[PDB]
Coordinates of C-alpha atoms and ligand atoms in Angstrom, one line a residue:
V5 CA 0.0 0.0 0.0
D6 CA 1.0 3.6 0.8
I7 CA 4.5 4.8 1.6
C8 CA 2.5 7.6 3.3
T9 CA 1.2 5.2 6.0
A10 CA 4.0 2.6 5.7
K11 CA 7.1 1.9 7.8
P12 CA 10.6 0.8 6.7
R13 CA 9.9 -2.9 7.5
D14 CA 6.5 -2.7 5.6
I15 CA 8.3 -2.0 2.3
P16 CA 11.7 -3.8 2.2
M17 CA 13.7 -1.6 -0.3
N18 CA 17.3 -0.6 0.6
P19 CA 19.2 0.5 -2.5
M20 CA 22.2 -0.9 -4.3
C21 CA 25.1 1.0 -2.9
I22 CA 25.6 2.3 0.7
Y23 CA 27.8 5.0 2.1
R24 CA 30.1 4.6 5.2
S25 CA 29.5 6.2 8.6
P26 CA 31.8 9.1 9.2
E27 CA 34.4 9.5 11.9
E32 CA 25.2 13.4 15.0
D33 CA 25.1 17.2 15.3
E34 CA 26.6 17.6 18.8
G35 CA 23.7 19.2 20.8
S36 CA 20.5 18.6 19.0
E37 CA 18.7 21.9 18.2
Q38 CA 15.1 22.9 17.3
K39 CA 12.9 20.4 19.2
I40 CA 10.4 18.8 16.9
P41 CA 6.8 19.8 16.7
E42 CA 3.9 17.6 17.8
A43 CA 2.8 14.5 15.9
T44 CA 6.0 14.5 13.8
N45 CA 8.5 11.7 13.2
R46 CA 11.9 12.5 14.6
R47 CA 13.5 11.3 11.4
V48 CA 11.4 13.4 9.0
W49 CA 12.3 16.5 11.0
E50 CA 16.0 15.7 10.8
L51 CA 15.7 15.4 7.0
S52 CA 14.0 18.8 7.0
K53 CA 17.1 20.2 8.8
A54 CA 19.4 18.4 6.3
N55 CA 17.7 20.2 3.3
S56 CA 17.7 23.5 5.2
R57 CA 21.5 23.3 5.7
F58 CA 21.8 22.6 1.9
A59 CA 19.4 25.5 1.1
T60 CA 21.5 28.1 3.0
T61 CA 24.9 26.7 1.9
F62 CA 23.9 26.4 -1.8
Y63 CA 22.5 30.0 -1.8
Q64 CA 25.9 31.2 -0.3
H65 CA 27.7 29.8 -3.4
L66 CA 25.0 31.0 -5.7
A67 CA 24.9 34.6 -4.4
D68 CA 28.7 34.7 -4.5
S69 CA 28.7 33.9 -8.2
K70 CA 26.3 36.7 -9.2
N71 CA 26.5 40.5 -9.0
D72 CA 24.9 41.8 -5.7
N73 CA 22.3 43.7 -7.7
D74 CA 21.0 40.6 -9.4
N75 CA 17.8 38.6 -8.8
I76 CA 18.2 35.1 -7.4
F77 CA 15.3 32.7 -7.3
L78 CA 15.3 28.9 -6.6
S79 CA 13.5 26.1 -4.8
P80 CA 16.1 24.2 -2.8
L81 CA 13.6 21.5 -2.0
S82 CA 13.2 20.6 -5.7
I83 CA 17.0 20.5 -6.1
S84 CA 17.3 18.2 -3.1
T85 CA 14.5 15.9 -4.3
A86 CA 16.0 15.5 -7.8
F87 CA 19.5 14.8 -6.5
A88 CA 18.1 12.3 -4.0
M89 CA 16.4 10.5 -7.0
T90 CA 19.8 10.7 -8.7
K91 CA 21.4 9.2 -5.5
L92 CA 19.5 5.9 -6.0
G93 CA 21.9 4.9 -8.7
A94 CA 25.0 6.4 -7.1
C95 CA 27.8 4.3 -5.5
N96 CA 31.3 4.6 -4.1
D97 CA 32.7 8.2 -4.2
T98 CA 29.9 9.6 -6.3
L99 CA 27.4 8.6 -3.6
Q100 CA 29.6 9.9 -0.7
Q101 CA 29.9 13.3 -2.4
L102 CA 26.2 13.5 -2.9
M103 CA 25.7 12.5 0.7
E104 CA 28.0 15.2 2.0
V105 CA 27.1 18.0 -0.4
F106 CA 23.3 17.7 0.4
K107 CA 24.0 17.4 4.1
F108 CA 22.6 13.9 4.2
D109 CA 25.5 12.6 6.4
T110 CA 24.9 15.3 9.0
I111 CA 22.1 13.3 10.6
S112 CA 21.7 10.0 12.5
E113 CA 22.8 6.6 11.2
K114 CA 19.3 5.2 10.5
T115 CA 18.0 8.4 8.8
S116 CA 21.2 8.6 6.8
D117 CA 20.8 5.0 5.6
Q118 CA 17.1 5.5 4.7
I119 CA 17.1 8.9 2.9
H120 CA 14.5 8.0 0.2
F121 CA 12.0 6.5 2.6
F122 CA 12.0 9.6 4.9
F123 CA 11.9 11.9 1.8
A124 CA 8.7 10.1 0.8
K125 CA 7.4 10.6 4.4
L126 CA 8.4 14.3 4.4
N127 CA 6.8 14.7 0.9
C128 CA 3.6 13.0 2.2
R129 CA 3.5 15.7 4.9
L130 CA 4.1 18.5 2.3
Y131 CA 1.8 17.7 -0.6
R132 CA -0.6 15.1 0.8
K133 CA -2.2 16.8 3.8
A134 CA -5.9 16.8 4.5
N135 CA -6.4 20.5 5.4
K136 CA -5.3 22.4 2.3
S137 CA -5.5 26.2 2.7
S138 CA -3.0 26.9 0.0
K139 CA -2.1 24.6 -3.0
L140 CA 1.3 22.9 -2.7
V141 CA 1.9 20.0 -5.2
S142 CA 4.8 18.1 -6.6
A143 CA 5.5 15.7 -9.5
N144 CA 8.6 13.7 -10.2
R145 CA 9.7 11.7 -13.3
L146 CA 12.3 9.7 -15.2
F147 CA 12.7 10.1 -18.9
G148 CA 14.9 7.4 -20.4
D149 CA 16.1 6.4 -23.9
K150 CA 13.7 4.1 -25.8
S151 CA 16.3 1.4 -26.8
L152 CA 17.9 0.9 -23.3
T153 CA 17.0 -1.6 -20.6
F154 CA 16.8 0.0 -17.2
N155 CA 17.1 -1.7 -13.8
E156 CA 13.7 -2.9 -12.8
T157 CA 14.3 -2.4 -9.1
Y158 CA 15.6 1.1 -9.8
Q159 CA 12.3 1.9 -11.7
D160 CA 10.2 0.4 -8.9
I161 CA 12.0 2.2 -6.0
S162 CA 11.7 5.5 -8.0
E163 CA 8.0 5.0 -8.7
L164 CA 7.2 3.9 -5.2
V165 CA 9.4 6.4 -3.2
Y166 CA 9.2 9.5 -5.4
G167 CA 6.2 8.9 -7.7
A168 CA 8.5 9.0 -10.7
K169 CA 7.3 6.6 -13.4
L170 CA 9.8 6.1 -16.3
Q171 CA 8.8 7.6 -19.6
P172 CA 10.6 6.3 -22.7
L173 CA 11.7 8.9 -25.2
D174 CA 13.8 8.5 -28.4
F175 CA 17.1 10.4 -27.5
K176 CA 19.2 8.3 -29.9
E177 CA 17.2 9.4 -33.0
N178 CA 14.9 12.3 -32.1
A179 CA 16.9 14.1 -29.4
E180 CA 15.6 17.6 -30.0
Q181 CA 12.0 16.5 -29.9
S182 CA 12.5 14.6 -26.7
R183 CA 13.7 17.7 -24.9
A184 CA 10.6 19.7 -25.9
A185 CA 8.4 16.9 -24.6
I186 CA 10.2 16.9 -21.3
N187 CA 9.7 20.7 -21.1
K188 CA 6.0 20.2 -22.1
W189 CA 5.6 17.8 -19.1
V190 CA 7.4 20.3 -16.8
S191 CA 5.2 23.1 -18.1
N192 CA 2.1 21.0 -17.4
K193 CA 3.0 20.2 -13.8
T194 CA 3.8 23.9 -12.9
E195 CA 0.6 25.4 -14.4
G196 CA 2.5 26.8 -17.4
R197 CA 5.0 28.8 -15.3
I198 CA 8.2 26.9 -16.0
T199 CA 8.1 26.2 -19.7
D200 CA 11.7 25.7 -20.5
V201 CA 13.9 24.0 -17.8
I202 CA 16.2 22.1 -20.3
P203 CA 18.0 24.5 -22.7
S204 CA 18.3 23.8 -26.4
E205 CA 21.1 21.4 -27.3
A206 CA 21.6 20.1 -23.8
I207 CA 20.2 16.6 -24.6
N208 CA 21.7 14.7 -27.5
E209 CA 22.3 11.3 -29.1
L210 CA 24.4 9.8 -26.3
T211 CA 21.7 10.8 -23.8
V212 CA 20.6 8.0 -21.5
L213 CA 18.3 9.4 -18.8
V214 CA 16.7 12.7 -17.6
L215 CA 15.5 12.9 -13.9
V216 CA 13.0 15.7 -13.3
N217 CA 11.3 17.2 -10.2
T218 CA 8.6 19.9 -10.3
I219 CA 7.2 22.0 -7.3
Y220 CA 4.3 24.3 -7.6
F221 CA 2.9 26.7 -4.9
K222 CA -0.1 29.0 -5.1
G223 CA -1.5 30.7 -1.9
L224 CA -3.9 33.4 -1.0
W225 CA -2.6 36.0 1.5
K226 CA -4.0 35.8 5.0
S227 CA -4.3 39.6 5.1
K228 CA -5.0 40.8 1.5
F229 CA -3.8 44.0 -0.1
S230 CA -6.3 46.4 -1.6
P231 CA -5.7 47.3 -5.2
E232 CA -7.1 50.8 -4.8
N233 CA -4.1 51.5 -2.5
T234 CA -1.6 50.0 -4.9
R235 CA 0.2 52.8 -6.7
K236 CA 3.0 53.5 -9.3
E237 CA 6.5 54.7 -8.7
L238 CA 9.8 54.9 -10.5
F239 CA 12.5 52.4 -9.5
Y240 CA 16.1 53.6 -10.0
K241 CA 18.5 50.8 -11.1
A242 CA 22.2 51.0 -10.1
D243 CA 23.2 51.8 -13.7
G244 CA 21.1 54.9 -14.0
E245 CA 17.9 53.9 -15.7
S246 CA 14.6 53.6 -14.0
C247 CA 11.4 51.6 -14.7
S248 CA 7.8 51.5 -13.4
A249 CA 6.9 49.6 -10.3
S250 CA 3.4 49.1 -8.8
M251 CA 3.9 49.4 -5.1
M252 CA 1.3 47.8 -2.9
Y253 CA 0.1 49.2 0.5
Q254 CA -1.5 47.8 3.6
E255 CA -1.8 48.3 7.4
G256 CA -2.3 45.5 10.0
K257 CA -0.8 43.2 12.7
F258 CA 2.1 41.1 11.5
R259 CA 5.1 39.2 13.0
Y260 CA 8.0 41.6 12.7
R261 CA 11.4 42.4 14.3
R262 CA 14.1 45.0 13.9
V263 CA 17.4 43.1 14.3
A264 CA 21.2 43.6 14.4
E265 CA 22.4 46.5 12.3
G266 CA 18.9 47.7 11.7
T267 CA 17.9 44.7 9.5
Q268 CA 14.1 44.3 9.3
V269 CA 12.5 40.8 9.2
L270 CA 8.8 40.7 8.2
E271 CA 6.4 37.7 8.0
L272 CA 3.5 37.4 5.6
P273 CA 1.3 34.4 6.3
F274 CA -0.8 32.7 3.7
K275 CA -4.4 31.6 4.7
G276 CA -4.1 28.6 7.0
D277 CA -0.8 29.8 8.6
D278 CA 0.9 26.6 7.6
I279 CA 3.0 28.4 4.9
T280 CA 4.3 32.0 5.4
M281 CA 6.6 34.3 3.4
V282 CA 9.5 35.9 5.3
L283 CA 11.1 39.1 4.1
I284 CA 14.6 40.2 5.1
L285 CA 15.5 43.8 4.4
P286 CA 18.9 45.3 5.2
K287 CA 19.1 48.8 6.7
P288 CA 18.3 51.5 4.2
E289 CA 21.9 52.0 3.2
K290 CA 23.5 48.7 4.2
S291 CA 24.6 45.9 1.9
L292 CA 22.8 42.5 1.8
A293 CA 26.2 40.8 1.6
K294 CA 26.8 40.6 5.4
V295 CA 23.4 39.1 6.0
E296 CA 23.9 36.7 3.1
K297 CA 27.4 35.8 4.3
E298 CA 26.1 34.8 7.8
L299 CA 23.1 32.8 6.6
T300 CA 22.8 29.5 8.6
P301 CA 19.5 27.8 9.4
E302 CA 20.3 28.5 13.1
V303 CA 20.4 32.3 12.5
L304 CA 17.2 32.1 10.4
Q305 CA 15.6 30.2 13.3
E306 CA 16.7 32.9 15.7
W307 CA 15.1 35.7 13.6
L308 CA 11.8 33.9 13.3
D309 CA 11.8 33.1 17.1
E310 CA 12.3 36.8 18.0
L311 CA 9.5 38.1 15.8
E312 CA 6.7 39.7 17.8
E313 CA 3.2 40.4 16.4
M314 CA 3.0 44.2 15.9
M315 CA 0.8 46.8 14.1
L316 CA 2.7 48.2 11.1
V317 CA 2.5 49.5 7.5
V318 CA 3.5 47.1 4.7
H319 CA 4.8 48.3 1.4
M320 CA 5.8 45.7 -1.2
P321 CA 5.8 45.6 -5.0
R322 CA 3.4 43.8 -7.3
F323 CA 5.9 41.7 -9.3
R324 CA 7.2 38.7 -11.1
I325 CA 10.7 37.3 -11.2
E326 CA 12.2 34.2 -12.8
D327 CA 15.6 32.7 -12.5
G328 CA 17.1 29.9 -14.8
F329 CA 20.6 28.5 -14.4
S330 CA 22.9 25.5 -14.4
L331 CA 24.0 23.8 -11.1
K332 CA 27.2 22.2 -12.4
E333 CA 29.7 24.9 -11.4
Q334 CA 28.1 25.6 -8.0
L335 CA 27.7 21.9 -7.0
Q336 CA 31.4 21.2 -8.0
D337 CA 32.6 24.1 -5.8
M338 CA 30.5 22.8 -3.0
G339 CA 32.1 19.4 -3.3
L340 CA 30.2 17.4 -6.0
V341 CA 33.1 16.3 -8.3
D342 CA 32.7 12.7 -9.4
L343 CA 29.1 12.8 -10.6
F344 CA 29.9 15.1 -13.5
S345 CA 33.1 13.3 -14.6
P346 CA 33.0 10.8 -17.4
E347 CA 36.0 8.8 -15.9
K348 CA 35.3 9.0 -12.2
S349 CA 31.5 9.1 -12.1
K350 CA 30.0 5.8 -10.8
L351 CA 26.3 5.2 -11.3
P352 CA 25.9 1.4 -11.7
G353 CA 22.2 1.1 -10.7
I354 CA 20.4 2.9 -13.5
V355 CA 20.7 0.6 -16.5
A356 CA 20.2 -3.2 -16.3
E357 CA 22.5 -4.0 -19.2
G358 CA 25.8 -3.2 -17.5
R359 CA 26.5 0.2 -19.1
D360 CA 28.6 1.6 -16.3
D361 CA 30.2 4.7 -17.8
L362 CA 27.3 7.0 -17.0
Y363 CA 27.9 10.5 -15.7
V364 CA 25.6 13.5 -15.2
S365 CA 26.6 15.9 -18.0
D366 CA 24.7 18.9 -16.7
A367 CA 21.8 19.8 -14.4
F368 CA 19.4 22.7 -14.8
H369 CA 17.2 24.7 -12.4
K370 CA 14.4 27.2 -13.1
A371 CA 12.0 29.1 -10.9
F372 CA 9.1 31.6 -11.1
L373 CA 7.7 34.0 -8.5
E374 CA 4.6 36.3 -8.8
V375 CA 3.3 38.4 -5.9
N376 CA 0.2 40.4 -6.0
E377 CA -2.7 41.7 -3.8
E378 CA -4.5 38.4 -3.6
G379 CA -1.5 36.1 -2.7
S380 CA 1.7 34.6 -4.1
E381 CA 2.4 32.1 -6.9
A382 CA 5.6 30.1 -7.3
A383 CA 6.8 27.2 -9.4
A384 CA 10.2 25.5 -9.9
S385 CA 11.9 22.5 -11.5
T386 CA 15.2 20.6 -11.6
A387 CA 16.4 18.5 -14.5
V388 CA 19.4 16.2 -14.2
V389 CA 20.8 14.9 -17.5
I390 CA 22.8 11.6 -17.6
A391 CA 25.2 11.7 -20.5
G392 CA 24.5 14.6 -22.8
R393 CA 26.3 17.9 -23.6
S394 CA 28.0 20.0 -20.9
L395 CA 27.4 23.5 -22.3
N396 CA 28.3 26.8 -20.6
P397 CA 25.1 28.8 -20.4
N398 CA 23.8 32.4 -20.0
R399 CA 26.4 34.5 -18.2
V400 CA 24.3 37.7 -18.1
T401 CA 21.1 38.9 -16.5
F402 CA 20.1 42.5 -15.6
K403 CA 21.7 44.2 -12.6
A404 CA 19.4 46.5 -10.6
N405 CA 19.5 48.1 -7.1
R406 CA 18.4 47.6 -3.5
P407 CA 17.5 43.9 -3.1
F408 CA 15.5 42.1 -0.5
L409 CA 15.6 38.4 0.5
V410 CA 12.4 36.4 0.1
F411 CA 11.7 33.0 1.7
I412 CA 8.6 30.8 1.3
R413 CA 8.5 28.4 4.2
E414 CA 6.4 25.6 5.7
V415 CA 5.9 26.2 9.4
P416 CA 5.3 23.0 11.3
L417 CA 8.1 21.2 9.5
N418 CA 10.4 24.2 9.0
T419 CA 11.1 23.5 5.3
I420 CA 12.4 26.2 3.0
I421 CA 10.3 25.6 -0.2
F422 CA 11.4 28.6 -2.2
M423 CA 14.2 31.1 -1.4
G424 CA 15.8 34.0 -3.2
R425 CA 16.6 37.7 -3.7
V426 CA 14.4 40.4 -5.4
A427 CA 16.6 43.1 -6.8
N428 CA 14.5 44.2 -9.8
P429 CA 10.8 44.5 -8.8
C430 CA 9.9 46.3 -12.0
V431 CA 7.8 44.2 -14.4
Ligands
LIG1 C1 22.5 1.6 15.3 O1 21.4 2.3 15.7 C2 20.6 2.8 14.6 O2 20.1 1.7 13.8 C3 19.2 0.8 14.5 C4 18.9 -0.3 13.6 O3 17.8 0.0 12.7 S1 17.7 -0.8 11.4 O4 16.8 -1.9 11.7 O5 17.2 0.0 10.4 O6 19.0 -1.3 11.1 C5 18.0 1.7 15.0 O7 17.0 0.9 15.6 C6 15.7 0.8 15.0 O8 15.1 2.0 15.0 C7 14.0 2.2 16.0 C8 13.5 3.6 16.0 O9 12.5 3.9 16.7 O10 13.9 4.4 15.1 C9 12.9 1.2 15.7 O11 12.1 1.6 14.6 C10 10.8 0.9 14.4 O12 10.0 1.2 15.6 C11 9.8 2.5 15.9 C12 8.8 2.6 17.1 O13 7.8 1.6 16.9 S2 6.4 1.9 17.5 O14 5.4 1.2 16.7 O15 6.4 1.4 18.9 O16 6.2 3.3 17.5 C13 9.1 3.3 14.7 O17 9.1 4.7 15.0 C14 7.9 5.3 15.2 O18 7.3 5.8 14.0 C15 6.1 6.6 14.2 C16 5.5 7.0 12.9 O19 4.4 6.4 12.5 O20 5.8 8.0 12.3 C17 6.4 7.8 15.1 O21 5.2 8.6 15.2 C18 5.3 10.0 15.1 O22 5.2 10.4 13.7 C19 4.0 10.0 13.1 C20 4.0 10.5 11.6 O23 5.3 11.0 11.3 S3 5.4 12.0 10.1 O24 4.1 12.2 9.6 O25 6.1 13.1 10.6 O26 6.2 11.2 9.1 C21 2.8 10.7 13.8 O27 1.6 10.4 13.2 C22 0.4 10.6 14.0 C23 2.8 10.1 15.3 O28 1.7 10.7 16.0 C24 2.1 11.2 17.2 C25 4.1 10.5 15.9 O29 4.2 9.9 17.2 S4 4.4 10.9 18.5 O30 4.0 10.1 19.6 O31 5.8 11.2 18.5 O32 3.6 12.0 18.2 C26 6.9 7.3 16.4 O33 7.1 8.4 17.4 C27 7.5 9.6 16.7 C28 8.2 6.5 16.1 O34 8.8 6.1 17.3 C29 10.0 6.8 17.6 C30 10.0 3.1 13.4 O35 9.4 3.7 12.3 S5 10.3 4.7 11.5 O36 10.9 5.6 12.4 O37 9.4 5.3 10.5 O38 11.3 3.8 10.9 C31 10.1 1.6 13.2 O39 11.0 1.4 12.0 S6 11.1 0.0 11.3 O40 10.0 0.0 10.4 O41 12.4 0.0 10.7 O42 10.9 -1.0 12.3 C32 13.4 -0.3 15.4 O43 12.7 -1.2 16.2 C33 12.0 -2.1 15.3 C34 14.9 -0.3 15.8 O44 15.4 -1.6 15.3 S7 16.0 -2.7 16.4 O45 14.8 -3.2 17.0 O46 16.8 -3.6 15.6 O47 16.8 -1.9 17.3 C35 18.5 2.8 15.9 O48 17.3 3.5 16.3 S8 17.2 4.1 17.8 O49 18.4 4.8 18.1 O50 17.0 3.0 18.6 O51 16.0 4.9 17.8 C36 19.4 3.7 15.1 O52 19.9 4.7 15.9 S9 20.2 6.2 15.2 O53 19.8 6.0 13.9 O54 21.6 6.4 15.4 O55 19.4 7.1 15.9
LIG2 C1 19.5 -3.2 -10.0 O1 19.5 -2.4 -8.8 C2 19.4 -3.1 -7.6 C3 19.2 -2.1 -6.5 O2 18.1 -1.3 -6.6 C4 20.7 -4.0 -7.5 O3 20.7 -4.8 -6.3 C5 21.3 -4.3 -5.1 O4 22.6 -4.9 -4.9 C6 23.1 -4.8 -3.6 C7 24.4 -5.7 -3.7 O5 24.6 -6.1 -5.0 C8 22.2 -5.2 -2.6 O6 22.6 -5.0 -1.2 C9 22.7 -6.1 -0.4 O7 21.8 -6.0 0.7 C10 22.0 -7.1 1.6 C11 20.8 -7.1 2.6 O8 20.7 -8.4 3.2 C12 23.4 -7.1 2.2 O9 23.6 -8.2 3.2 C13 24.4 -7.2 1.1 O10 25.7 -7.3 1.5 C14 24.2 -6.1 0.1 O11 24.4 -4.8 0.8 C15 20.8 -4.4 -2.7 O12 19.9 -4.9 -1.7 C16 20.3 -4.8 -4.0 N1 19.0 -5.0 -4.3 C17 17.9 -4.2 -4.0 C18 16.5 -4.8 -4.3 O13 18.0 -3.3 -3.4 C19 20.8 -4.9 -8.7 O14 22.1 -5.5 -8.7 C20 20.7 -4.0 -10.0 N2 20.7 -4.9 -11.2 C21 21.4 -4.7 -12.3 C22 21.2 -5.7 -13.4 O15 22.1 -3.8 -12.4
LIG3 C1 -1.7 19.3 -17.9 O1 -2.1 17.9 -17.7 C2 -3.4 17.8 -17.2 C3 -3.6 16.3 -17.3 O2 -2.8 15.6 -16.4 C4 -4.4 18.6 -18.0 O3 -5.6 18.8 -17.1 C5 -6.7 18.0 -17.6 O4 -7.5 18.9 -18.3 C6 -8.9 18.6 -18.5 C7 -9.5 19.8 -19.1 O5 -8.7 20.5 -19.9 C8 -9.4 18.1 -17.1 O6 -10.8 17.9 -17.1 C9 -11.6 18.9 -16.6 O7 -12.3 18.5 -15.4 C10 -13.0 19.6 -14.8 C11 -13.7 19.1 -13.6 O8 -12.7 18.3 -12.9 C12 -14.1 20.2 -15.9 O9 -14.7 21.3 -15.3 C13 -13.3 20.5 -17.1 O10 -14.2 21.0 -18.2 C14 -12.6 19.3 -17.7 O11 -13.5 18.2 -17.9 C15 -8.6 16.9 -16.6 O12 -9.2 16.4 -15.4 C16 -7.2 17.4 -16.3 N1 -6.4 16.3 -15.8 C17 -5.8 16.3 -14.6 C18 -5.0 15.1 -14.2 O13 -5.8 17.2 -14.0 C19 -4.0 20.0 -18.4 O14 -4.8 20.4 -19.5 C20 -2.6 19.9 -19.0 N2 -2.1 21.2 -19.5 C21 -1.8 21.3 -20.9 C22 -1.4 22.6 -21.3 O15 -1.7 20.4 -21.6
NAG4 C1 33.7 0.8 -5.1 O1 34.0 0.6 -6.5 C2 34.4 -0.7 -7.0 C3 34.3 -0.6 -8.5 O2 34.6 0.6 -9.0 C4 33.4 -1.8 -6.4 O3 33.9 -3.0 -6.9 C5 33.4 -1.7 -4.9 O4 32.4 -2.7 -4.4 C6 32.9 -0.3 -4.5 N1 32.9 -0.2 -3.0 C7 31.7 0.0 -2.3 C8 31.9 0.0 -0.8 O5 30.7 0.2 -2.8

């Protein structure tokens, strides 16, 4: 039956390869909420350590006046799926990079199971206020013979059926179909995850994750109070920007160095949007430099309901980029190397030369008077073309950090930086 009601012994599944136990975060922090499996919560902490760390590298590789938008959950889910077929040093690297080894022995050895559990809690909860769904998938070459266990564990644990496409002969048309499926799952918001020419004739498998969020604000903004105003980019140019207005009671706190932290709850209170604004003339860099899940937890736990005036733009951002460079810097070497990569659990027919050529991410965010919409997707390509993509996106001034979190479980669904609010 269900992995949602099941327990480890119910579904005997343990993957092919297993990682060693290192030479237990000393002094467990953040006591778990009620009716919540210890193990799930630990996984939630693992992903949050990846979220902050990944952002750190990401924000370091862009101009400070750039927009950054991602869904670290999606990235984690997709790599965990990828992890199924990993072994030896490729698996250890994934384990460390994603923070999967920074938790207890049992949880560490049962990543996928707990991810299914954690996902059951995220998307399959009986008291929906806001919509939060997810869809996973495997797209593999039509002529190959994949490992049956691999399929089964991936369908059972992540809901990822395996769709056969003709990479070998119709490469270009396969990609489009993958993007069409991704567009479908994200309500036409993420239409182009995989970039032209990335998939080719030597392409074996494409692992995709999709996350979609749409929530109504708990305290709406009146459109008759929304107004226009010029926004001055760093360069010199300006653009129009519809700035919304509202007055009410909201969790807020003025922190160290004058940094303001504001919380905007979606109906239900299960999911909220946190905003982090540096002091008027203060750079975001320091805050971004000292961004650990501990510090974040401190800010949120200091917040005190207060009556205030909220001013925020009606906007839409979108980020699209490749994760190869960043992950490598962060420790993920083997997985992308055609000589050292070791993924022996994907294809039945002993073709053990696989390597992830490139992996793409793409997010979308829209904020308005009614609520907030967000979508995202990760696509990992096994054996295609490593291409060096888009090295230029608009630089604008005075950015704020945005976070779309799930409260009970403390999961960072979406996270980023809005520099250019003009649409
Ligand atoms: C070397 O040491 C490490 O490895 C060994 C060997 O493990 S191995 O066999 O994999 O090799 C570990 O030992 C095993 O682990 C035990 C453990 O408790 O983790 C134990 O697991 C099995 O039994 C437990 C308890 O059984 S119970 O039926 O009496 O409860 C079971 O855990 C329970 O799961 C419940 C669950 O349904 O979720 C929890 O309920 C809460 O959460 C639910 C929903 O969660 S979620 O929605 O967030 O996902 C919630 O729903 C309403 C409940 O409502 C309240 C919550 O309960 S509440 O009261 O807290 O609110 C239970 O409480 C939270 C939870 O008990 C702790 C476990 O299920 S699993 O955790 O999902 O896996 C089950 O696993 S099993 O299927 O594999 O059996 C094993 O005994 C059978 C034990 O094996 S042994 O017998 O050989 O020793 C070491 O674990 S430990 O240190 O002993 O804990 C492990 O150490 S470590 O990894 O270094 O920590
Ligand atoms: C297809 O993939 C499956 C994995 O999904 C491959 O089998 C896996 O192989 C390892 C060892 O070869 C198995 O682990 C074993 O677990 C036992 C538990 O008793 C342990 O004692 C052993 O020392 C070892 O660790 C793993 O369980 C296993 N199978 C499953 C169902 O998980 C299989 O080899 C792949 N087939 C092809 C053709 O590639
Ligand atoms: C993305 O894929 C989904 C299918 O997986 C497509 O949604 C499907 O669309 C039809 C209508 O276009 C849905 O049926 C509708 O049912 C409602 C009531 O439930 C009714 O009022 C409508 O007139 C229609 O009968 C169908 O259920 C739905 N499938 C799922 C699984 O949701 C969607 O169109 C796809 N998008 C694109 C662009 O292809
Ligand atoms: C590591 O790799 C070799 C083959 O490259 C394999 O024979 C060995 O079993 C692997 N070790 C572990 C612990 O998986």
